[PDB]
Design a protein around this ligand. Structure first.
Ligand SMILES: Cn1nc(-c2cnc(N)c(-c3ccc(C(N)=O)cc3)n2)nc1C1(c2ccccc2)CC1
Length: 820
């Protein structure tokens, strides 16, 4: 049984557990055991929770940030359903009471014992919340569809729970002996050394003696910093390059081991290739020992030298600048450091940036202020997670402050908290403990944590860290491990099926290619693997029976698969589809869609609903991911083709979109579609401007039959080819109800763009803090300060609300000027 679990994890994580043992590392071995225990302890607490508390794990409530409606309800062991006229203000218990009141008349005779399951979905309806607050009910009101729910008893939820069971005395300066190398290049070679505490230096960078292109230096390189002054999170960064400048390779390492002891003596560093000094990069060597260039160094002995315990550390014009700074200004903040904790605790970040980390006595005083520092708000704590604040206790302080995070707020920032793991120095950290703990406390969190980690196993620098985390998770959840295995098996067949489609497309016609996709899918192994799975894009969405006859592929370069599903239990709710893309990177798209999804949350938090389409996007592997099918939608280009035999026969190209909406929304339905279009058009106008999405043609802009506009293929963001505001004549025509002159509908639309832009500006720091944590991701279009600077300009944070709104009106008028 124990062997089975081991081999099952290996396949799921895509890296055999034998590999972890084959390294024979104490850090790897200590992580695996300490975390297994923590995960198994968390699995035990889960097995004793109540049936309602279990639902909070297995099926977390999807909640939104008077008027009666028709609702259909049925029981578990029957087909007979009941239709009720219940209000939006009604609690699920009142609906549960109605279901038991209409059962007592049919069966001829307590709501607290039940839970309402969503038909063919891993979503539930429970708690003291009105029906209209539920995301499932809320969607059914706008679309007009009838909600289908199932009455599930406490004993059946408990049946699910059971079947799912498992020192300062060192005044000498710092030095290293740069022995030899084992590189290959074609000139002289220099080795640059630097001591770092985050993004900034501890002492000036020292270069080596110029040696010709297997080189031997054998030189002791000294640094302008004492051994006793060296902070706990001190990083020794190297850069091997060639000069007559050409970068070859880079390599960094911690001065203290995971056991806090200062490192001595000999070390072989397997260097990572280059594009000069990179402090952000990993502290572990290139696992390609076969072809990786080595850097042999010696750490001169001082004798055990463990870093001092916290008890030893603890024993040892102002307001105007508080809204990059001069030296006198930095001294001022360090001078009145006690007054900062008392009156401005939220300014901790600026105080942590001015402290001299290269002076151990300044660090001790700072840590004493930190150990009595009151809990920072989630927002302020998100800034502390950045590489700018590397200290272990500072990292611990951020986690401690982030513990107040809701499962809904954590789901919005999970991607950033996963990418921040790349900044980490040691395997066992306060972040991983938090990420694993929250994952084993909420199944939806654990689902996305796994997928964010898995999709990056192909990246060698994070393959060891992520593989170890996923292993620990599977110890804490054996059932979910088997659930995610079904998802991994489905994605395996999809890659093979797509590989055939890519070959076939270059050899024969699409009708014959599509027919041989169906033949490949209708095979037992394909049929079984591609069916009855939780959607990796959303665990609550169940992809049951695969609708092979409706499966096709897209005509774009990498031939993306179009996989449709069907459900008996759900009906129309189970008529969901997925897109399997292979060959392109879906990381930027995921990022852009999460940023757009947040804007929509922040708009709904101020009352405004701009009818945004936050369709799922998830990279699942090596240039491989999934995209959620937006049903009953089409591109501007496919709508504007003005093809014959169709109900939308337009005379002018501007009338194409409006005529399309006329056939899809008749008479009194068209009026709703225009407002749906106008709000989404306004929503995406601000979103694309703020995020800086360029090259927006008719092929990457889509419309829903409801009128709703959305954007696809986010290939280039942050104006990385500055981009202006975009307005199309075809859209203004739809907004103005199909009239050449209608200022009333245009000014009401101009009001939506203004309201949306002003809201975002207030949360402008939130977008900055998250995009800065996303610099860790290694995205080619988000790697420097000039990328982050785009938002500070597009949102205009430095200016006031009156100046920023006026400057926005300047950009909006230029978009209408460019509009023919
Ligand atoms: C009908 N219909 N619907 C959609 C569609 C729906 N929801 C989506 N989320 C996407 C999408 C999103 C992002 C990317 C990307 N990351 O680039 C790609 C696609 N597309 N597409 C088609 C069309 C189609 C043609 C042939 C076969 C199948 C379909 C007519 C174009």
């Amino acid at each position: 049984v124990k062997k089975l679990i081991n081999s099952q994890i290996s396949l799921l994580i895509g890296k055999g557990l034998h590999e972890f043992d084959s390294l024979r590392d104490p850090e790897v071995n200590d992580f695996r055991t300490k975390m297994r225990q923590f995960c198994e302890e968390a699995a035990a607490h889960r097995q004793q929770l109540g049936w309602v508390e279990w639902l909070q794990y297995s099926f977390p409530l999807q909640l939104e940030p008077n008027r009666a409606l028709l609702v259909n309800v049925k029981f578990e062991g029957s087909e007979e359903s009941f239709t009720f006229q219940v209000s939006t203000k009604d609690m699920p218990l009142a609906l549960m009471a109605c279901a038991l009141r209409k059962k007592a008349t049919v069966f001829r005779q307590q709501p607290e014992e039940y839970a309402l399951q969503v038909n063919g979905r891993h979503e539930y309806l429970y708690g003291n919340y009105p029906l209209c607050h539920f995301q499932y009910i809320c969607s059914c009101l706008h679309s007009g569809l009838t909600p289908h729910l199932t009455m599930v008893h406490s004993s059946s939820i408990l049946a699910m729970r059971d079947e799912q069971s498992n020192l300062w005395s060192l005044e000498q300066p710092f030095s290293i002996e740069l022995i030899e190398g084992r590189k290959v290049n074609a000139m002289k070679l220099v080795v640059q050394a630097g001591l770092f505490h985050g993004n900034e230096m501890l002492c000036k960078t020292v270069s080596s003696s110029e040696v010709n292109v297997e080189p031997v230096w054998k030189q002791r390189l000294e640094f302008d910093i004492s051994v006793c002054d060296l902070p706990r999170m001190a990083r020794l960064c190297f850069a091997l390059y060639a000069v007559v400048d050409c970068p070859i390779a880079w390599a960094n390492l911690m001065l203290f081991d995971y056991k806090d002891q200062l490192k001595t003596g000999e070390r072989c560093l397997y260097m990572w290739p280059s594009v000069l000094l990179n402090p952000a990069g990993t502290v572990r060597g290139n696992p390609n020992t076969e072809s990786a260039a080595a850097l042999v160094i010696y750490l001169p002995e001082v004798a055990p030298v463990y870093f001092p315990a916290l008890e030893k550390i603890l024993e040892l014009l102002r307001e105007i600048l508080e809204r990059e700074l001069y030296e006198h200004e930095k001294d001022l903040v360090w001078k009145m450091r006690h007054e900062v904790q008392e009156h401005f605790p939220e300014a901790l970040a600026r105080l942590l940036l001015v402290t001299k980390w290269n002076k151990h006595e300044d660090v001790a005083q700072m840590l004493y202020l930190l150990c009595s520092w009151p809990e920072l708000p989630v927002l302020s704590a998100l800034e502390l997670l950045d590489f700018s604040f590397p200290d272990c206790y500072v990292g611990s302080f951020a986690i401690k402050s982030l513990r107040k995070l809701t499962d809904d707020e954590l789901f919005q920032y999970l991607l950033q908290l996963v990418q921040v793991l790349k900044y980490e120095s040691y395997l066992d950290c306060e972040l991983t403990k938090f990420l694993l703990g929250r994952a084993l406390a909420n199944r939806k969190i654990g689902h996305f944590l796994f997928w964010h980690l898995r999709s990056e196993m192909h990246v060698p620098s994070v393959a060891l860290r992520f593989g170890l985390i996923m292993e620990a998770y599977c110890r804490g959840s054996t059932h979910h491990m088997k659930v995610l295995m079904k998802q991994g098996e489905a994605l395996s067949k999809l890659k093979a099926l797509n590989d055939f489609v890519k070959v076939s497309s270059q050899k024969t016609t699409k009708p014959q290619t599509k027919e041989m996709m169906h033949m490949c899918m209708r095979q037992e192994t394909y049929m079984e693997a591609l069916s009855h799975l939780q959607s990796p894009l959303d665990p609550s969405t169940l992809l049951e029976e695969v609708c092979v006859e409706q499966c096709t592929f897209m005509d774009s370069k990498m031939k993306p698969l179009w996989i449709m599903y069907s459900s008996e239990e759900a009906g129309s709710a189970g008529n969901v589809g997925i897109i399997f893309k292979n060959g392109d990177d879906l990381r930027q798209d995921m990022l852009t869609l999460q940023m757009i999804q947040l804007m929509d949350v922040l708009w709904k938090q101020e009352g405004l609903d701009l009818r945004m389409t936050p369709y799922g996007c998830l990279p699942t592997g090596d240039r491989t991911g999934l995209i959620e099918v937006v049903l009953h939608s089409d591109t501007i280009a496919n709508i504007q083709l003005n093809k014959s035999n169709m109900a939308a026969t337009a005379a002018f190209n501007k009338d194409a979109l409006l005529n399309w909406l006329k056939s899809k929304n008749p008479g009194e339905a068209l009026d709703r579609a225009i407002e749906e279009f106008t709000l989404s058009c306004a929503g995406y106008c601000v979103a694309t401007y703020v995020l800086g999405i360029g090259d927006r043609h008719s092929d990457n802009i889509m419309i829903r039959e409801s009128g709703q506009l959305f954007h696809i293929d986010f290939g280039h963001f942050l104006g990385n080819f500055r981009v202006p505001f975009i307005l199309t004549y075809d859209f203004v025509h739809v907004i103005q109800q199909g009239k050449t002159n209608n200022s009333e509908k245009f000014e009401r639309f101009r009001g939506y763009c203004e309201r949306a832009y002003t809201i975002l500006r207030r949360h402008g720091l939130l977008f900055l803090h998250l995009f800065a944590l996303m610099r860790a991701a290694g995205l080619p279009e988000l790697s420097c300060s000039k990328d982050i600077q785009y938002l500070k300009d597009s949102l205009a944070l430095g200016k006031t609300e009156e100046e920023a709104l006026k400057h926005f009106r300047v950009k909006f008028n230029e978009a209408l000027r460019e509009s023919w």
